[PDB]
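ligand=5IV
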Amino acid sequence: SMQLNPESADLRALAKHLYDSYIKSFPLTKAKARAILTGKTTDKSPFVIYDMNSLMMGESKEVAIRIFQGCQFRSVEAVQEITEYAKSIPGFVNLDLNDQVTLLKYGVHEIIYTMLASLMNKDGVLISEGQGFMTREFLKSLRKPFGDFMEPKFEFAVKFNALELDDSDLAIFIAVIILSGDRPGLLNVKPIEDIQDNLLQALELQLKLNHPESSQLFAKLLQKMTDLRQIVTEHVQLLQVIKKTELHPLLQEIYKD
Ligand SMILES: O=C(NCc1ccc(NS(=O)(=O)C2CC2)cc1C(F)(F)F)c1ccc2c(ccn2Cc2cccc(F)c2)c1
C-alpha cells in the first residue's frame, strides 16, 4: 500500500472489477450467508435439518443417497457459477481453450470448498441457496462411508473462517486459485503465471488495505491453497471408494484424467 500511484490504482480497479463480477456470478455471498446465519436477514428463516425427523419434513441408505444427489446437483450449478466468473478475469479467455478447460478442471473443487466455508458456522451449512441449514452432527451421523464426507470441509472452514475474509478478499483469492500455473497438461504456464502474479499483487494490496491489524494474512491465505489441494485429493480417495460401494456426466468429465 506504501504509495498511491498509477500501479496501485490499476490493482484497485482489478479488485473492483473482480468483486463486481463475483457479486454477478455468486447470488449467495458471504455477507448474505452471515446475515442468514445470524437471524438478521429479511428472507424467511431457513428450515433446520438436525435429525432423520427434520430431514423428512425438509424433503438409512436412501436418506444418504438423496443428500449426496443434491450435493452433486448443487456442485454442477456451482461449476456454472464459477465458469461465468473465470470468464470475467481479465486475460483468461486469451489462453489456449485447452488450458482454460484445464485451469477450471482442477479449480472448481478448490473454489467450491472455499465458498462452502462462507455458508458454514460451527453448527452446520446453508444448503439450497439459504432455504435450508443442515447440521455438522447430522451429516456426521449418516451411514459410513458417506457419514464423514463433510467433516474435512467443516475442519477446513473453521480455520479458513477465522481469517475473516469478506467477499472483496475472496473474489481475488478465488481468481488466484483458477490461474494456478502447476495444473497438469497446461500448454503455456507463462501467460497463466503472468496473470496470477498481477492477481497476487492485487490480493496483497487488498489484504493490507482491508485487514490493517492482521499479521501475515497474505502468507496464511497462500498456505490455504495447500490445505485445498489436500482436501480435494481426500475427496477423490472417498469417491474412488463409492465406486466399489455404490456421479453426474460433467463431474465425471472433471474426475477423469
Ligand atoms: O446446497 C446443497 N449442498 C451444497 C454442497 C455442495 C458440495 C458438497 N460437497 S461435494 O459434493 O463433495 C463437493 C466436491 C463437490 C456438499 C454440499 C453440502 F450439502 F454439504 F453443503 C444441497 C444439499 C441438499 C440438497 C440440495 C438439493 C436438494 N437437496 C436435498 C434437500 C434438503 C432440504 C430441502 C430440500 F428441498 C432438498 C442441495
